[PDB]
Structures are given as C-alpha cells and as structure tokens.
Chain length 279, copies 3
C-alpha cells in the first residue's frame, strides 16, 4: 500500500538508488514529467525515482513541470514523496555540508503552475484552498531525522540543544526556506532582507513541489542540502560527500516508512483535499 | 445620476440583494466577466451585482477576470464599486466576525492582468501610471463606515479610541491588506512575516480589483470580512459566525447604496476621470 | 577596444550621430532603432528604453532584446539611467544614485537568456549577483560627477549635515516594482523599513541580463520625487526631471571618456569567464 516516491535535485540527476525493475515513460493531464520514472524496491518497499531537472539537468527551476512530476508519482501509486533541495545558508549555524529537514517556507516564486485545480481547460474542475500552516508531513519529517540518526549522522535540534551541541556536519531538526524563482542568485541586499526575516536557507525548487504534493494527497518531506552560505557572507568536494550521506538518509527513510502503518495518515491526506474544496 | 456596482466575494456568490429587474450577459474587450450581471434598484438608486467567483464559486482568485469585471460594470455606467473580501486576520484586535473598511494594501500577487493599458494590441493604447498612495475612494470608504453605524454595528478607530473601545464584533475604520496569489493559504512562516510588516489582514482578491477600478475612473471601496485568524495563531460555530457576518455585510451594503444615492457626486466623478487622463504618461 | 551602450530611461527617449541602426535579436525586436556615434574616439550607442514615443511600459520592455542588441553591436559597457522615487530623507528630488544593490519585486518579465524553451538559448545559467553591478564602471560614474563639479555624497564616510544638494549618492539600493501603478503608502513604508533607498520600475532584469551578456553594467538613478511615504504622479516625474537631465547628460558623456581612457582587457575576460563558469548544465 505504501510506495515511496523520490524527487532528486542537484547531485541526483541520475541517482541509481536501487536495481531498476522498470522504466516508465508517462504523461499526465498537466504535461510530461522532467524525465522517465524508475521503479524498484528498497527491501520490501516499492520505490520510484525521478530527477527534478532531468538526467542532464537541462531544465532550470522555473521551467520544471512540478504538476507533472508530482501527478506522475501519484499515478504510479506513491503515497509519499521524499525530495532533495540544494540551498544556500542564511545563518551562521547552518554550515556547508549540513542538511536541513524543512518545516516552513516563504514563497517568492512566480510564473509557475502551483495548483492542479482551476477554471481553465488546463486544470481539474474545482477551487481548492489547501491549508499550509505546517506545509510538510510531520511523520515523514521525523522519518528523515530518525533515518539520519540510524546512519550515525549528527542531528541538531535548536529547541532541545544549546549551541555547543551543534557538531558539523549535522542535520538540522527544523528550518525555514525562502524559495526564489531563479535562475540568478540573490543580491547581497536580498540575502540580508531574507536573513532579517528569520529565514534559514534560500533555494529555487521547494515551491510549488511541496504544495502540489499535499494537493495530490501525498505525504511530502524535503531534505535541504547546504552547498554554501548565501551571499550575506562575503567546494564540489563538500557537496560530493553530502550526496553520499543524503543517499544513506533516503534509503534508510524508505525502509522506515515501510516499517509502519500509514492507513490513517493516508486517509487524512485524502480527506484534507476533499475538505479544502471551496466549490 | 449614480449607479452602484457590487462585486460580491465569498458568501455573495448568489447575493439576491434586490428584486432582479434585468440581467446582462455581456463581454468586454478583455474577456468575459465572472458571470451574468444582475440589475435592479435599492430604493431609487440603480444597482448592479456581480459575483467575483461566479454563481457556483468555480473561479479561483488567481483566475478571476478583474479587468472584465471592472470594465463590464463601467460599460453599464456604474459610478461606484462596492466590494466584499473574505480574509484572515494578522492581528489580535481583529477577530473573526469583525469587518474592515480597508484604506491600504501590500501586493504580492502575480500573473494577473492588472492594467487596461499597454503597448500590446490586446490592451488599450497608451501607458497609464496611476498614483496609488491612498488606493481607495475616501468618500466611499466613509460611506461604508457610516452605513455600519446606521445599522447599529460597532465602529472602532484605533487612531482615536483606546483599545478599550474595541468591542466585537466591530467594523475597523482603517486597515491594511496583504494580497497573496493563492489558491493555497499562507504558511506559518509567511503569516508571521506579514504580521511583522504590520499588515492587518490577508486576502486573495483585493488586488488588482482596486487598482483597475481607479483606472476605470470609478469610486471603489472594500469591506473585508474577517472569517478567521491566519495561521500565525469547532467548525460549526465558524460557519455560523460567517453566515452572521454575511447578514451584517448585506445590510451594510444595502445602506451604503442608499447613502451614495443621497449625495451629489459630480465633482468626485469628474476628479475620478481627470485622474485617469493625468496619468496618461504617453500624453506629453 | 571599448564601446559604450547607453540605455536611456525617462527623459532620455547625446552627440553628433553617425547613423541610425535597426537590429534584430533572437529574443525579438529592441525598444527602438539605435543611434550610433562617437564621444571623442570612443564608439557609443544610444537606445531609449521605452521607445521614441515612450509607448512601452516598464513591464513590457524587451530587456533581453535591448541588452543583446547592444552586445551584438560590440558593446563592452552599458550605462543606464533610471527615474526613481526616494525612500529616505537624505535623497531629494534632483539627486542621483550610483546604485550598488537591489531588491527584485518584478514578475512576468523575460529575465534570462537561457532555458529549455525554444525561444531561449539552450542551457541552465545560474549567475552570481551578490554585487550585481560592475564596480569599476560604478566608480567611473562617480568620478565623472566629480569632473563635472557635481557634489558626491558618501554615507559611509560623510555626515548627514555635510550632504550638499544636488548630489550623486556614491551607493544605494533600489527596489524594482513591476508597474505600471505607483506604490501605496503601505508598500512605500514597508520598502523604507527594509532599508531600501529608492523605488523604480526598470532596473531589473536589465542589470541581470547585462551580466549574462558579459557586459560591464552600471546604473545612475535619477530621483524625481519622494515616494508617497511623505506628505508622486506622472506629471511630477517629468517636471523635476528637466534640470536633472542636463547633469546626467554631462555625467554620461564624461563617463564614456573615462572608460575609453583605461584598459579593460582583464575585466572583459573576467566578464565572459563568469558567464561560462555559471553554466550548470555542463
Ligand atoms: N544560495 C542559493 N540560492 C538559491 N538556490 C540555490 C542556492 C544554492 C543552491 N541552490 C540550488 O541549486 C541550484 C542553483 O545552484 C538551484 O536548483 C537551487 O535551488
Ligand atoms: N486567511 C486567508 N488568507 C487568504 N485568503 C482568505 C483567507 C480567509 C478567506 N480568504 C478568502 O476566501 C477565499 C479562501 O477561503 C479566497 O477567495 C480568499 O480571498
Ligand atoms: N516613485 C516611483 N516609483 C516607481 N517608479 C518610478 C518612480 C519615480 C519614477 N519612476 C519611473 O518612472 C516610470 C514610470 O513613471 C518608470 O520607468 C519608473 O521606474
């Protein structure tokens, strides 16, 4: 019943997380996904891998068909989506090499299809107004964090640990992301403004992927990879080692997801979609 | 003579504000309005009603044809537009059941047609740069407020009265709205950011409706309906509270139309159109 | 050698022209035809942002075509003028700002040369924009003002009481809004509380696209009024502008000469190198 979709960002243009069982060239009512979808098994848990930018990373963040990617995963029977998201750090405690299991975001994107529903032929009929107060699936967030612990990777929770317990590299138990449209990076002026707003990282791909996953009735969680500090503070090796440990986290997270019942969580996801219909 | 247009938001998809005299199924050079326009009278005052989202609430905020809506009302000869706007509160003193006669906004929408003019053939010829310092028609704002007074609804003015005078439910005499694109609600992160900017409410429909009304030379005023606290902070009571708010807003609207028709608006209307002409930057 | 493109904003819709040139671009047609000529020995190209009739609003300007057309003609530098409203007390109508920073609030504009759609160059370009302008070219605009005996105010070293108007502000940040409407008081105060200096509609993505084209770009903002945070309309932007046009013209002509008097070999190399190294599809 549980099937785990994986959307790989930078460093995961072609992951190979398991032996490929089948390759799926699909289309959706909202167009074609970034690439073909690879189906397989992690242990006894069915799993589907999909590169957000395509195999060659030729599709910029603003042009990614988030609808197609999410809906395609949904059509294949995924109940969860795990995503990676490379990012810049807006805080001194978040150091290149750290990961962040996001729990909040601020949206500054535009010109992207951010919803499956509407009044145009491009969309499913209805007006969907989805609650996003806490935009991720909390259970699945805690999976990612527990996965890191299982793989002996440091975890820092600012709510229960003081500064001295922050050993790098570490996974930050929470954090907020600002999603900019791209493709350019932020100016120093924009970086300081975001930092003053209390944001933790800056990224170009989280939104509307996270929003559409909830719309599709899926449990979604992102692991953000701190590649560098954003330009408020004036290499490839740290990122190479990062994807190795992110691979471990993803593989362990899939197993942890399959080790539990999700019947009521899946049911509540579906009901929230139906209850958010305004029409 | 005046003619008052009414753009009904949530809770006003099918208003029935008066006995329908005539219905207009029209189009504009900017496309189709949300729905048929219903014409009639409030007393001796001509009035036109249009649901922003259509009868069945099938049109989401981002896809509403604000241009067509404002232009269709203009074509029928409306001089004023009164709008309802459902919203979430960003401040402690603004509670569900309150109303807000907006005077300010902050815009965070995109991908919406927000001007009638441009250099493209599918827009009116010319470049219009409208001043928007005080984006509403002040006279018409004060009419909404006085209408609330006449209907025995509490009015609260933070600049004059102590917070000890804020008695719920009340019409807030001033307020700023942040307009987000939707269709999703804000995250807690976005809610606290907006609140820290000093914004009072969050809503998805105010802009560019208010902007386009000024571009059309019309007097525009919005009454926001506080349906809930935004996520910075039983549903059966929430629904019942909103229904009561709708009853109150309905009588405010009806009294407002009567108040408008009772006064002379020659100079205000003249100033409305002159403001349009003087913003034509291509006329130098 | 060097060649200077000049993108004129409001009131700039400069020399003895050699010829007028019509050009096309893989991203459409520029705002207008281009004026080719010389300031001294320095080749110079002049392009009005809104067209000769100012019929093109800021959100509909083809910044891609304008910047690329200047590139196609062999420009190494672009000087730009941008009319703006002030968000702070010390910046008054008649002042000028040699911008070093911005905050972007535009939408629906073509802001990159690269992408995966047919009407764009193939590739994913992620350009660093920490310091979005060419610093050398900024300091040239500022030095140009000194040569023409226009006051220069540096808020990093100078007193608020030592601010002599009209002056060129040696640094400043712009918020770029989409237009065509002006800001509300609410928006104006929010921008002010963010620490931004001016508000305008034309800087972005022009500045971004110039760096994509590997050109040294600098902007001089012309303060036409205070934004509505004080006690702004179309007619006001035009009137104040008149006296400011003359000073800006002097600065631009002087700046062109100053550019032509230095070697830009390594700067140009670095510009084109930054373009290549930002390609993340490779
Ligand atoms: N400091 C930043 N600001 C915005 N995006 C960033 C960073 C750092 C990494 N990314 C992500 O990686 C790609 C561009 O480098 C894009 O996919 C982007 O999401
Ligand atoms: N807390 C909020 N944030 C943003 N919009 C809100 C609310 C509450 C109500 N609305 C308005 O009503 C519709 C969404 O329910 C939309 O039409 C919207 O304008
Ligand atoms: N206070 C302001 N806010 C926004 N834009 C302003 C100003 C003042 C000038 N401009 C510039 O003038 C043009 C539109 O009038 C546009 O080119 C615009 O950049």
């Amino acid at each position: 019943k549980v099937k785990v979709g994986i959307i790989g960002g930078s460093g995961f243009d072609d992951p190979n997380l398991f032996k490929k069982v089948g390759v799926r060239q699909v289309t959706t009512p909202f167009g074609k996904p970034s690439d073909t979808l690879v189906e397989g098994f992690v242990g006894d848990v069915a799993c589907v891998v999909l590169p957000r930018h395509g195999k060659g990373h030729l599709i910029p963040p603003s042009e990614v068909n988030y609808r197609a990617n999410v809906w395609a995963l949904k059509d294949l029977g995924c109940t969860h989506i795990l995503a990676t998201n490379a990012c810049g750090s807006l805080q001194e405690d978040l150091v290149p090499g750290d990961f962040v299991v996001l729990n909040q975001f601020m949206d500054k994107t535009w010109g992207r299809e951010n919803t499956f529903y509407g009044s145009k032929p491009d969309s499913l009929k209805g007006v969907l107004h989805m609650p996003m107060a806490e935009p991720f699936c909390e259970r699945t967030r805690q999976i990612l964090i527990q996965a890191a612990r299982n793989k002996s990777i440091n975890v820092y929770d600012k709510k229960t640990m003081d500064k001295s317990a922050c050993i790098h590299p570490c996974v930050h138990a929470e954090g907020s992301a600002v999603t900019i449209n791209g493709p350019r990076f932020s100016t120093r002026c924009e970086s300081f403004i975001h930092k003053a707003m209390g944001l933790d990282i800056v990224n170009m791909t989280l939104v509307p992927e996270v929003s559409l996953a909830r719309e599709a009735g899926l449990s979604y969680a992102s692991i953000a990879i701190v590649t560098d500090f954003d330009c408020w503070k004036s290499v490839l090796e740290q990122f190479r080692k990062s994807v190795v440990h992110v691979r471990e986290i993803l593989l362990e997270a899939v197993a942890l997801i399959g080790a539990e019942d999700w019947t009521k969580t899946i049911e509540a996801n579906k009901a929230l979609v139906m209850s958010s219909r305004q029409d």
